[PDB]
DNA sequence: CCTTTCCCCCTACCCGAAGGGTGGGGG
């Protein structure tokens, strides 16, 4: 079926061996947190599938001790991804969170620190209009191939899923590192 | 391209003395 090769893309995309599953109550607005290695979180694929037909959003991010350079972009529109593409900022994977509501997640490296990965978000927020609050180092994405309830229950797709590191990535963070260690002079 | 999804392990309390049986909670 196709909510398992949704998962199965995207977590060949993420490229992390182990990821938090973040499971929120539509109700309370409780974030229930599960770490999964990759095949663990195929393996429990149909509570997922349950969970979420209870009602439940199924939300998506690397493991804290994770090694990655992955940076989540939310709250996009085709002409945001189409200026990211052409500016060096292709997405590892797209996920259409609602009908025509995207968001992106951007490798900029194999690995990158959480002080990088932070300050590479806030700019990636600035530079395509995508939403401040969203833009941190742990910042939960959606999974695909699960319902969106909260909306107003329409499928979350996966659009693409290539997993290349961006263009722009090594130099995201040579920029990011020359930023960090900038603000970090200006100490007295 | 884009479906209509549907779990299981851990543990307080139980009788009635010693550990296994059972319900409820919760990831």
New binding site residues.
């Given amino acids: ?3 398992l ?2 998962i199965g ?1 995207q977590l060949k995309a993420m490229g992390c061996e182990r990821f938090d599953i973040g499971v929120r109550d539509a109700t309370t607005g409780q974030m ?3 770490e999964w290695s990759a095949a663990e979180v195929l393996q429990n694929t ?9 009602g439940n959003d199924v939300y998506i991010r690397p493991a804290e001790q994770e090694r990655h350079g992955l940076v989540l972009v939310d709250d996009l529109s085709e002409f945001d991804l189409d200026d990211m593409k052409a500016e060096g900022r292709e997405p590892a994977l797209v996920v ?1 969170t609602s009908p025509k509501n995207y968001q992106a997640w951007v490798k900029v490296a194999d690995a990158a620190g959480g002080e990088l990965r932070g300050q590479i978000a806030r700019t990636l927020a600035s530079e395509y209009d995508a939403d401040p609050a969203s833009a941190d180092s742990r910042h939960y994405g959606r999974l ?4 969106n ?1 909260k909306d107003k ?7 693409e899923s290539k997993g290349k590191t961006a263009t722009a990535g090594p130099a995201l963070v040579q920029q990011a590192g020359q930023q960090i260690e900038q603000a970090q002079r200006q100490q007295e």
């Avoid at 695909?144 to 319902?147: E, K, L, M, P, Q």
């Avoid at 229950?153 to 659009?159: A, I, M, S």
Wanted: proline residues 6%.
């Fill in positions: 079926d196709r909510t090769q949704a893309r229930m947190n599960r149909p509570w997922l599938k349950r969970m979420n037909a209870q259409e695909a191939g699960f319902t309830r229950q329409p499928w979350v797709l996966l659009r």
